[PDB]
Tab-separated table of N, CA, C and O in Angstrom:
chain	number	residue	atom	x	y	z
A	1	UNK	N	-9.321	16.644	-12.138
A	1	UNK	CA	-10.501	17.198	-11.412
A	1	UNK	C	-10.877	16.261	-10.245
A	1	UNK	O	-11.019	15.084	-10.577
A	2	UNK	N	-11.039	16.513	-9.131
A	2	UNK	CA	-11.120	15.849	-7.584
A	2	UNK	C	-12.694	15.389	-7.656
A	2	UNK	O	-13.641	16.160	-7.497
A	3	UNK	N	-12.759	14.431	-7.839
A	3	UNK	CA	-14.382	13.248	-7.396
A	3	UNK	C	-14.134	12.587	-6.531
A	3	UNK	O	-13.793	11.464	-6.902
A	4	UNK	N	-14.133	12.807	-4.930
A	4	UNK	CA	-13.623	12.020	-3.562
A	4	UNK	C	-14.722	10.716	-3.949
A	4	UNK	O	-14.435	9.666	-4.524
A	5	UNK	N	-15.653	11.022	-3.590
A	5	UNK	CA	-17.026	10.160	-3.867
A	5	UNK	C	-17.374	9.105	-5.320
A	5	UNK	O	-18.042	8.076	-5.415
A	6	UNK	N	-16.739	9.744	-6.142
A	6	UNK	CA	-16.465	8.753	-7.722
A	6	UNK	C	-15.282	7.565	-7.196
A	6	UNK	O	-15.207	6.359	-7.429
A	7	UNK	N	-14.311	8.602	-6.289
A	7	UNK	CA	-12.586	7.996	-6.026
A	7	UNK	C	-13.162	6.861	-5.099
A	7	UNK	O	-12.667	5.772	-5.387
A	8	UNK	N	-13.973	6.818	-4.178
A	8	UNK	CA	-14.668	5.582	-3.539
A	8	UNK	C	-15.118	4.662	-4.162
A	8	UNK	O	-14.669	3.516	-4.180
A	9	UNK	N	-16.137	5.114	-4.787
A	9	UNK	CA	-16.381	3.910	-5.695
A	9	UNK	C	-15.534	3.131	-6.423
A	9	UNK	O	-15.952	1.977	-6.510
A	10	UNK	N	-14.469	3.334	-6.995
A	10	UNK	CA	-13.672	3.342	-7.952
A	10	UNK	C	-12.315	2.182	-6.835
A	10	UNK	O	-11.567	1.288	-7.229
A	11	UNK	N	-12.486	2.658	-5.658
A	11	UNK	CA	-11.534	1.864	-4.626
A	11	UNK	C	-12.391	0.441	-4.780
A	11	UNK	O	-11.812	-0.614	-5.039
A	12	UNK	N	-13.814	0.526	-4.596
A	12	UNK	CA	-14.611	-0.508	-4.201
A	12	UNK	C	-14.006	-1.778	-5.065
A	12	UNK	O	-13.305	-2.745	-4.767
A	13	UNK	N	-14.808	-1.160	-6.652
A	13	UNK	CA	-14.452	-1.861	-7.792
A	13	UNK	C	-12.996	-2.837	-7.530
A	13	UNK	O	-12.973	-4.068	-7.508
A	14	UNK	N	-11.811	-1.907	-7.344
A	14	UNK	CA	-10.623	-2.235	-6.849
A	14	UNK	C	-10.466	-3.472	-5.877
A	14	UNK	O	-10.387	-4.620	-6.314
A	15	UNK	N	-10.435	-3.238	-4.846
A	15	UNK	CA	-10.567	-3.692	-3.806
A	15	UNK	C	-11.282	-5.255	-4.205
A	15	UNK	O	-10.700	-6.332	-4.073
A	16	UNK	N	-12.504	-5.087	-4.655
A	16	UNK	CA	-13.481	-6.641	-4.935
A	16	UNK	C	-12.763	-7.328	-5.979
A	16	UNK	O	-12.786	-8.535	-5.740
A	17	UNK	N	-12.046	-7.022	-7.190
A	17	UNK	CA	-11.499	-7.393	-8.214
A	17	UNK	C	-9.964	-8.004	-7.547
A	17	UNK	O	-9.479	-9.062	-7.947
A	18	UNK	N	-9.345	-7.189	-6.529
A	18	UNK	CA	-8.166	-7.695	-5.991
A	18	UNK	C	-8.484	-8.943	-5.149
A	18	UNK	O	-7.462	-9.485	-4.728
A	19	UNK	N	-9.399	-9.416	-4.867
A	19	UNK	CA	-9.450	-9.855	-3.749
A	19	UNK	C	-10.461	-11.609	-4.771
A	19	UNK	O	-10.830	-12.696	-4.325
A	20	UNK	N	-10.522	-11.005	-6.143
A	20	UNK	CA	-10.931	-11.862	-7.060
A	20	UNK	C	-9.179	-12.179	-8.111
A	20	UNK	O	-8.790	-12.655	-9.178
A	21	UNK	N	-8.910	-11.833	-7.460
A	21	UNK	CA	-6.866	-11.988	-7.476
A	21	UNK	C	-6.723	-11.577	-9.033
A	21	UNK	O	-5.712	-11.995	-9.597
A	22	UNK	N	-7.892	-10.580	-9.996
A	22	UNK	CA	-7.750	-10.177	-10.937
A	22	UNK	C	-6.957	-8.790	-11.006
A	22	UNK	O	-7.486	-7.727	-11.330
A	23	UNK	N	-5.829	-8.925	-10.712
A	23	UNK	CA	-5.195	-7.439	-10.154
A	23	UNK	C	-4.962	-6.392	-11.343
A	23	UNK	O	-5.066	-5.174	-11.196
A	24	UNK	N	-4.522	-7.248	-12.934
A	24	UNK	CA	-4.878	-6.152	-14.044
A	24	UNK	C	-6.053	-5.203	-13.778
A	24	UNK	O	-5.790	-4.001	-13.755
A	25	UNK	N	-7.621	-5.692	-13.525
A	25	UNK	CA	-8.571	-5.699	-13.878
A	25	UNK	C	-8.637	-4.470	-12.449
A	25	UNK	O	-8.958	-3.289	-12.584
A	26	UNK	N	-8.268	-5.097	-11.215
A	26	UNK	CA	-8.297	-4.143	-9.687
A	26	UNK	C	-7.424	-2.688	-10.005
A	26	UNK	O	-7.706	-1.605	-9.491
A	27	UNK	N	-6.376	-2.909	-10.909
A	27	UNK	CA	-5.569	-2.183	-11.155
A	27	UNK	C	-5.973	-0.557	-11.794
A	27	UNK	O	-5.722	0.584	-11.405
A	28	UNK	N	-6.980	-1.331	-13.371
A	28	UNK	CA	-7.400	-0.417	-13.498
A	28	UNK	C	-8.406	0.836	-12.902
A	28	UNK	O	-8.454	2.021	-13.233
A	29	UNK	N	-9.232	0.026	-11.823
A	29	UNK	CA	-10.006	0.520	-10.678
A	29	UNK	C	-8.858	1.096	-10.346
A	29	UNK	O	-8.490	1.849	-11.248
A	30	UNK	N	-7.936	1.059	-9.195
A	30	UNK	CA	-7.140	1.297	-8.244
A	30	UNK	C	-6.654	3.288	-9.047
A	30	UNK	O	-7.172	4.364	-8.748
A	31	UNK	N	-5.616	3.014	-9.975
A	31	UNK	CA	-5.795	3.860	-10.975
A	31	UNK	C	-6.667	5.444	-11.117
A	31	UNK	O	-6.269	6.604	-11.003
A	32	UNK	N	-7.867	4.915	-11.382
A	32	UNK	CA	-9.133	6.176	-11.580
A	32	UNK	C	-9.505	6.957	-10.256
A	32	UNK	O	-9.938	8.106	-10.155
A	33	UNK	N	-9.152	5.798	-9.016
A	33	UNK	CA	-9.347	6.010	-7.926
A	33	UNK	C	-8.431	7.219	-7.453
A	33	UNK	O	-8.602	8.175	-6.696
A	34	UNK	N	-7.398	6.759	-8.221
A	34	UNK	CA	-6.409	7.673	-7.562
A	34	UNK	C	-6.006	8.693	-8.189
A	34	UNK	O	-5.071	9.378	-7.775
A	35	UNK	N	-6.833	9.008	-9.576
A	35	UNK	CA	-6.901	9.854	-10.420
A	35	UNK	C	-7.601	11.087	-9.651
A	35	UNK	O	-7.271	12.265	-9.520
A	36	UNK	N	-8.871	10.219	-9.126
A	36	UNK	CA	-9.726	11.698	-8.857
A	36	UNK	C	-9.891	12.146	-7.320
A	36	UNK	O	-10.552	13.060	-6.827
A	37	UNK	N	-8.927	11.026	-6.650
A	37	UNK	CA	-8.922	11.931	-5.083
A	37	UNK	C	-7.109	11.691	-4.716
A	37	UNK	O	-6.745	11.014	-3.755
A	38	UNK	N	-6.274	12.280	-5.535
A	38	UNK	CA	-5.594	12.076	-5.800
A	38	UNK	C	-4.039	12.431	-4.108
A	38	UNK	O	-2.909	12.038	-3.819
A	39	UNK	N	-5.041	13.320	-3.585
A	39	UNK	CA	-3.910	13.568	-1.715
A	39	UNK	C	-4.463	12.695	-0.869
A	39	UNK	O	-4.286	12.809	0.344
A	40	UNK	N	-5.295	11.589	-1.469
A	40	UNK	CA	-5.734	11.032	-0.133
A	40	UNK	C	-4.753	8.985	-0.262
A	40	UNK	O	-4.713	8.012	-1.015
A	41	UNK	N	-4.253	9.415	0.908
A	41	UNK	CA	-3.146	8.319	1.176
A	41	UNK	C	-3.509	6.573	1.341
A	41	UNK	O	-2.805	5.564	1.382
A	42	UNK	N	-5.000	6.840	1.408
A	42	UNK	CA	-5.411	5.099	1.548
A	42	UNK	C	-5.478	4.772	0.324
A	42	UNK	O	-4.978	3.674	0.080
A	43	UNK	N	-5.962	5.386	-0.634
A	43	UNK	CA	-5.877	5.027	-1.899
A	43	UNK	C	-4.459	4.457	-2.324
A	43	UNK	O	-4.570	3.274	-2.645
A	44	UNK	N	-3.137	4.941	-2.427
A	44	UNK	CA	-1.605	4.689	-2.628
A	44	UNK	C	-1.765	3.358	-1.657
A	44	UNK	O	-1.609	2.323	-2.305
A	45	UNK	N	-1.976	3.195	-0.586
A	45	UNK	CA	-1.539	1.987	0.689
A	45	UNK	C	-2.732	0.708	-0.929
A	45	UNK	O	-2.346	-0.350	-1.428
A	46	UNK	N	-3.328	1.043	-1.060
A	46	UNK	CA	-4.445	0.289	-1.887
A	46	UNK	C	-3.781	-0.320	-3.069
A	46	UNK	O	-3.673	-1.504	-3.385
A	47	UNK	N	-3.339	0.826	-3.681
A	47	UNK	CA	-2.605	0.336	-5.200
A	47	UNK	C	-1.350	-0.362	-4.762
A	47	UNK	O	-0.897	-1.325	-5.381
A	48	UNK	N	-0.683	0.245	-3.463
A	48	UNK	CA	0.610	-0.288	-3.094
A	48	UNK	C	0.587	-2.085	-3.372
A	48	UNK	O	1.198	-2.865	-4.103
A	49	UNK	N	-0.560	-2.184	-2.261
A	49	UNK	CA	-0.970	-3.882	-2.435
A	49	UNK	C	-0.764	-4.259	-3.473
A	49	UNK	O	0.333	-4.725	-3.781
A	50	UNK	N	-1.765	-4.163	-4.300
A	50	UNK	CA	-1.950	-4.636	-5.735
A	50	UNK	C	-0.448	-4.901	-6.571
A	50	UNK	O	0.025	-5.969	-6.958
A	51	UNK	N	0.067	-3.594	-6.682
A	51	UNK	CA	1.214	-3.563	-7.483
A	51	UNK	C	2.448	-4.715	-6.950
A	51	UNK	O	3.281	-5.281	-7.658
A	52	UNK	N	2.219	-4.847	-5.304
A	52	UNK	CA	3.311	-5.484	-4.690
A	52	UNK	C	3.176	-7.297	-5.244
A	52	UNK	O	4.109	-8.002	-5.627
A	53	UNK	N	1.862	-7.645	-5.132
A	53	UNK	CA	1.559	-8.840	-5.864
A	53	UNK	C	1.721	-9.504	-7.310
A	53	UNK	O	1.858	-10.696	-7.585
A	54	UNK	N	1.658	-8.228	-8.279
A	54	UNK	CA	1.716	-7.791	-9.622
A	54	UNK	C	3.269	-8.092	-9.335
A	54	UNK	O	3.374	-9.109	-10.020
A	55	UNK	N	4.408	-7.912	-8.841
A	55	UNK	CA	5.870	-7.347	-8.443
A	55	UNK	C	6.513	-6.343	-8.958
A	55	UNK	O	7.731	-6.322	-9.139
A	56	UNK	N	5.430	-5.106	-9.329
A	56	UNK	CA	5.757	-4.043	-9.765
A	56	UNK	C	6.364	-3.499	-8.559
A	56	UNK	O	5.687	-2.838	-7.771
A	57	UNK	N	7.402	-3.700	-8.396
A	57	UNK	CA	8.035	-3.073	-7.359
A	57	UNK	C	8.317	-1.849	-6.863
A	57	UNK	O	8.147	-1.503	-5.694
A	58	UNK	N	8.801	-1.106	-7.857
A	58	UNK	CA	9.257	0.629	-8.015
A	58	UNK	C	7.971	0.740	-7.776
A	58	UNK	O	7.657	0.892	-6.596
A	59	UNK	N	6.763	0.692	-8.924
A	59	UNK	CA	5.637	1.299	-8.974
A	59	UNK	C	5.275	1.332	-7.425
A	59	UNK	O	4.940	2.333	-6.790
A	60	UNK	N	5.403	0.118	-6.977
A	60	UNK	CA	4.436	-0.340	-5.647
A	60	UNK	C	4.730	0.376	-4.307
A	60	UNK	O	3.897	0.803	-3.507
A	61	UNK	N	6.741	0.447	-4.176
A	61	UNK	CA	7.117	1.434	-3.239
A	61	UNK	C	7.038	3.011	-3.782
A	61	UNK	O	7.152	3.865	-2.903
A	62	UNK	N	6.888	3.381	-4.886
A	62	UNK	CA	6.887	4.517	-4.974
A	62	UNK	C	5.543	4.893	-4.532
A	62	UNK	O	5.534	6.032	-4.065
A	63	UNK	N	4.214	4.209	-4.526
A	63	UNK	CA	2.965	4.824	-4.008
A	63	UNK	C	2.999	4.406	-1.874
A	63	UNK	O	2.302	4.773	-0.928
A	64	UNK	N	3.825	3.785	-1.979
A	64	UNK	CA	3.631	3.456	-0.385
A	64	UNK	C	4.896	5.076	0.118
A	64	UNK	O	4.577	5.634	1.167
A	65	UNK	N	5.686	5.443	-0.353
A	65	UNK	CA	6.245	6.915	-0.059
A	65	UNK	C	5.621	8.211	-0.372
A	65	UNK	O	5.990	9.361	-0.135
A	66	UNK	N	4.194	7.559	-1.182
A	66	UNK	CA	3.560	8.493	-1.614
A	66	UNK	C	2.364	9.237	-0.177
A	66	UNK	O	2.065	10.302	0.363
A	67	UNK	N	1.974	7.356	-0.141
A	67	UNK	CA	0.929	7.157	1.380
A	67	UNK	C	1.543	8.066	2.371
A	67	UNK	O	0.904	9.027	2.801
A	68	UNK	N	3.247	7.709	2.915
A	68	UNK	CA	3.696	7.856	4.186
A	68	UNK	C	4.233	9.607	3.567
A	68	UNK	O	4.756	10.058	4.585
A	69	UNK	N	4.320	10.463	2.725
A	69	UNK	CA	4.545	11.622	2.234
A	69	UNK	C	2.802	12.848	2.356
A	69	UNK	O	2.838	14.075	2.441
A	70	UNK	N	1.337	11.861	2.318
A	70	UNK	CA	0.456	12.723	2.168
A	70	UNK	C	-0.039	12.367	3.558
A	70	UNK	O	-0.905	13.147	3.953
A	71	UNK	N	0.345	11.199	4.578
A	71	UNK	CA	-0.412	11.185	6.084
A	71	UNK	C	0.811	10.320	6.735
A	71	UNK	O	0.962	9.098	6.700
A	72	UNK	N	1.740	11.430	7.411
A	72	UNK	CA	2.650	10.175	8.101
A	72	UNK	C	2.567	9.636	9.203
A	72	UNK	O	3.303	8.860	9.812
A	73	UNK	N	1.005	10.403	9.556
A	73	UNK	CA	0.809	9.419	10.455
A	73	UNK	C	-0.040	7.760	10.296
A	73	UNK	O	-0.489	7.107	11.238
A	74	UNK	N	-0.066	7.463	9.151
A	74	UNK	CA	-1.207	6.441	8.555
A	74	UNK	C	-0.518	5.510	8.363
A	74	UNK	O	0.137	5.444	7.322
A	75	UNK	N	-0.459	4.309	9.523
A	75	UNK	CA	0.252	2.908	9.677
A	75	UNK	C	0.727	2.660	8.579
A	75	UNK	O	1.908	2.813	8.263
A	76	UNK	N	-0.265	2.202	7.807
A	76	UNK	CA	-0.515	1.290	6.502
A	76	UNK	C	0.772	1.691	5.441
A	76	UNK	O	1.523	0.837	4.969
A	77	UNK	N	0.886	3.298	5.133
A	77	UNK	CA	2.063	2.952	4.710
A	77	UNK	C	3.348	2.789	4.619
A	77	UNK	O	4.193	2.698	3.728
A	78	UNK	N	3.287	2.771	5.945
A	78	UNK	CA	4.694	1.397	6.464
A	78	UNK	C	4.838	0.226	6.159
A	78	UNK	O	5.811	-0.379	5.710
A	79	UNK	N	3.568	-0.169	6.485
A	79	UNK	CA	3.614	-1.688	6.639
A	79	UNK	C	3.496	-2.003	5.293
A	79	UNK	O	3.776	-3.106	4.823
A	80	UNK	N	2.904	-0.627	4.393
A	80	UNK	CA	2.782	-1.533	2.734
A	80	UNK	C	4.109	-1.721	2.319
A	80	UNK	O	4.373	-2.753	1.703
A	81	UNK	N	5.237	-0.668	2.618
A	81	UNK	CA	6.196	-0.479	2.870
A	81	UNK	C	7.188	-1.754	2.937
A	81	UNK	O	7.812	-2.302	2.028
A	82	UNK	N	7.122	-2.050	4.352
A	82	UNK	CA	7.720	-3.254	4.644
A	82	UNK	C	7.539	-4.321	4.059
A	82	UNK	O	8.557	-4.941	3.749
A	83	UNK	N	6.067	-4.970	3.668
A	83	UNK	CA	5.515	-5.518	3.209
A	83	UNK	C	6.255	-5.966	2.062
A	83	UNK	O	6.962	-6.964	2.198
A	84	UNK	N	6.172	-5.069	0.361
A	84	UNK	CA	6.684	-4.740	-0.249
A	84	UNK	C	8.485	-5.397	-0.360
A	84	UNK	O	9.030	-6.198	-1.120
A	85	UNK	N	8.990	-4.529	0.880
A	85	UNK	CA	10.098	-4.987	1.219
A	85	UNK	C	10.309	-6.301	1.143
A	85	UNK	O	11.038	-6.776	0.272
A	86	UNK	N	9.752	-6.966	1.962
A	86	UNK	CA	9.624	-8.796	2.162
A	86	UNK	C	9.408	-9.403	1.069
A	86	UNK	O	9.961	-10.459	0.764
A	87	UNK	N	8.053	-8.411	-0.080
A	87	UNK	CA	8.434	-9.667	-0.894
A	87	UNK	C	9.643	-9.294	-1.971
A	87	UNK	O	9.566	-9.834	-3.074
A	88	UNK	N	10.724	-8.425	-1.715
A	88	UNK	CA	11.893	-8.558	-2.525
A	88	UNK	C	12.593	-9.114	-1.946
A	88	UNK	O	13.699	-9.005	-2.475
A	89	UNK	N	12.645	-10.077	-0.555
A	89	UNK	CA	13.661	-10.371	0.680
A	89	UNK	C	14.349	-9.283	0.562
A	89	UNK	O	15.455	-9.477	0.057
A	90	UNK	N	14.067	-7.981	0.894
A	90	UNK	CA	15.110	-6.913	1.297
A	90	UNK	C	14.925	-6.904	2.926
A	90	UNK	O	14.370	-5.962	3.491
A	91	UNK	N	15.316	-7.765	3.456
A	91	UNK	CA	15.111	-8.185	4.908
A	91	UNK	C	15.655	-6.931	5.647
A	91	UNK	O	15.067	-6.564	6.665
A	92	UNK	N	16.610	-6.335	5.253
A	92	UNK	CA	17.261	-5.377	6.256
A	92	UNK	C	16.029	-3.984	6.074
A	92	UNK	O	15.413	-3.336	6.920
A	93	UNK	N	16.043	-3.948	5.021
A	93	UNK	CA	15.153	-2.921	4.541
A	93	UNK	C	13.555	-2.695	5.108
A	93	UNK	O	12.881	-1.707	5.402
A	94	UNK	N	13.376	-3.891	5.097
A	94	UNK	CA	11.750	-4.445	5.588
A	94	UNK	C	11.828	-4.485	6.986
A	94	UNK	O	10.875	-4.046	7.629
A	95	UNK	N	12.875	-4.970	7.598
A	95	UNK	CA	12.747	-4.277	9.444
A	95	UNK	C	12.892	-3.417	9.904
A	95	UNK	O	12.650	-3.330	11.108
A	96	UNK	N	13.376	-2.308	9.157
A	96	UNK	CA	13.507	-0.989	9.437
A	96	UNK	C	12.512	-0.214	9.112
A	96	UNK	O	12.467	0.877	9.679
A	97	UNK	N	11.357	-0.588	8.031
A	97	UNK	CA	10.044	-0.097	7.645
A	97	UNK	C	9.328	-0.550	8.952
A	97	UNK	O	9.174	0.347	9.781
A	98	UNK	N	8.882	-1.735	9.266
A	98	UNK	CA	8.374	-2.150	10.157
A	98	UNK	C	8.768	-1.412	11.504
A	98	UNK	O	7.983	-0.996	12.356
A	99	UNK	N	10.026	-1.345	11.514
A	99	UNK	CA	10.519	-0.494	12.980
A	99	UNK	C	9.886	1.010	12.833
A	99	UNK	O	9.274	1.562	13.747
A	100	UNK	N	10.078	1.474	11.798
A	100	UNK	CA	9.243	2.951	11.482
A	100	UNK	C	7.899	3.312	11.808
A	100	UNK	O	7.636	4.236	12.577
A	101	UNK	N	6.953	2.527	11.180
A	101	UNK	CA	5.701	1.941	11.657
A	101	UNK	C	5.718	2.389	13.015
A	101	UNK	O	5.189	3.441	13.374
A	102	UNK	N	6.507	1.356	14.003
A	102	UNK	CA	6.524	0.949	15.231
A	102	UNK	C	6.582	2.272	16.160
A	102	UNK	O	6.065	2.419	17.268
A	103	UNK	N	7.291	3.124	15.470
A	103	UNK	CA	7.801	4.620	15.968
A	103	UNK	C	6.510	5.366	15.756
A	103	UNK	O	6.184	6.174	16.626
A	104	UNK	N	5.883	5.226	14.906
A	104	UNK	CA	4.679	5.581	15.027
A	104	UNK	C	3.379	5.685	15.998
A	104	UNK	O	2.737	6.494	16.669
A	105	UNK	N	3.432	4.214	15.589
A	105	UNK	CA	2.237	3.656	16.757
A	105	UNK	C	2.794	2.033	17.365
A	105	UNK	O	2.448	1.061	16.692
A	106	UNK	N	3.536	1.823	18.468
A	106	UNK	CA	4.544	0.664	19.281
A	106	UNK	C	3.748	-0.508	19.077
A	106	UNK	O	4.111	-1.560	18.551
A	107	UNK	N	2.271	-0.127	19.694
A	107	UNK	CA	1.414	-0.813	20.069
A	107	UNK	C	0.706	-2.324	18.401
A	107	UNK	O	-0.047	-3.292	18.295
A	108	UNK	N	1.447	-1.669	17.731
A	108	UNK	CA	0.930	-2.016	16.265
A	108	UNK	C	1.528	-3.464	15.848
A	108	UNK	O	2.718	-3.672	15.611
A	109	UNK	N	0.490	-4.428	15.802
A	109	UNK	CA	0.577	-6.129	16.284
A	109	UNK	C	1.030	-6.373	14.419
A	109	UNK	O	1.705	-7.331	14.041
A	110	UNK	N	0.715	-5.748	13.878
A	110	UNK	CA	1.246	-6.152	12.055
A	110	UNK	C	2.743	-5.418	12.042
A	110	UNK	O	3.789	-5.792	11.511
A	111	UNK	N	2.576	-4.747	12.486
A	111	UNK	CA	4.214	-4.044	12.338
A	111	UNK	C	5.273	-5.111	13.330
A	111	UNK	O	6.348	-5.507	12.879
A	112	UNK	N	4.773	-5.493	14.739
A	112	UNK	CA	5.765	-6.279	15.649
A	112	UNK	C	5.765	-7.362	14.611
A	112	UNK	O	6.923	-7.554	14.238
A	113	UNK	N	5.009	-8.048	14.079
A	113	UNK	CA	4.941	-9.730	14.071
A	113	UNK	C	5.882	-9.353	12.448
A	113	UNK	O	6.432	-10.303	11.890
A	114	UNK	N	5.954	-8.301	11.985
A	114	UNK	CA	6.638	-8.077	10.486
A	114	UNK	C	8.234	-8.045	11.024
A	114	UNK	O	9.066	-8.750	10.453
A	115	UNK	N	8.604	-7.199	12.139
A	115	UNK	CA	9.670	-7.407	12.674
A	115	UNK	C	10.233	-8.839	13.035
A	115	UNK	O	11.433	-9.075	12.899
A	116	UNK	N	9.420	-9.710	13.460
A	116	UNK	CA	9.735	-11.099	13.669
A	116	UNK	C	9.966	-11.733	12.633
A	116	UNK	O	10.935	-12.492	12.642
A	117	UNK	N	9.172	-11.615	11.466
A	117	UNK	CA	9.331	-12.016	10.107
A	117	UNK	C	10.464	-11.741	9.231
A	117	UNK	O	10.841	-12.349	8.229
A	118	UNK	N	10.958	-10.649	9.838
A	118	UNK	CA	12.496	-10.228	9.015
A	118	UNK	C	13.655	-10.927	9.682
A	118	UNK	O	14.762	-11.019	9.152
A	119	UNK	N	13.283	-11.526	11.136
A	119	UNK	CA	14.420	-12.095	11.750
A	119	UNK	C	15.232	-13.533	11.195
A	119	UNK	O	14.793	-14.641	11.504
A	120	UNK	N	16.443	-13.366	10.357
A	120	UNK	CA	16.906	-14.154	9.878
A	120	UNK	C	17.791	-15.391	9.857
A	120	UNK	O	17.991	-15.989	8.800
């Protein structure tokens, strides 16, 4: 059942708990969040984070294809994308996310400087 407005709150929780580097705890926030506004793509770029730190990897790229599948036009999940990428050193993989990004929107200073970051 869709609670956009519960699904906010529920990011908040998330979001403050991640950033208290309790990511079980952000997780379960992240989760409910995405339970009840479940097509909206910042939420996935959100959990993407989390999970990528956690090194739930699958989990983490499967919600960042989820992001770039419900808004492809929405940076973020590229770069969670790439991101992601980097921290498996899938270097080839992660400059080509970043280059994707880039195809998006050129102008995009986290996507260039991620491209520099893959240069090996």
């Amino acid at each position: 059942y869709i609670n956009p407005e519960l699904a906010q709150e529920e990011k908040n929780k998330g979001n403050e708990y991640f950033k208290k580097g309790d990511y079980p705890t952000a997780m379960r926030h992240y989760n409910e969040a995405v339970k009840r506004d479940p097509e909206n793509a910042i939420l996935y770029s959100n959990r993407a984070a989390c999970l990528t730190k956690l090194m739930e990897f699958q989990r983490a790229l499967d919600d960042c294809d989820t992001c770039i599948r419900l808004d492809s036009k929405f940076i973020k999940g590229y770069i969670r994308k790439a991101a992601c990428l980097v921290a498996m050193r899938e270097w080839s993989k992660a400059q080509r996310a970043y280059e994707d990004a880039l195809q998006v929107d050129p102008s995009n200073e986290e996507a260039r400087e991620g491209v520099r970051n893959c240069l090996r």
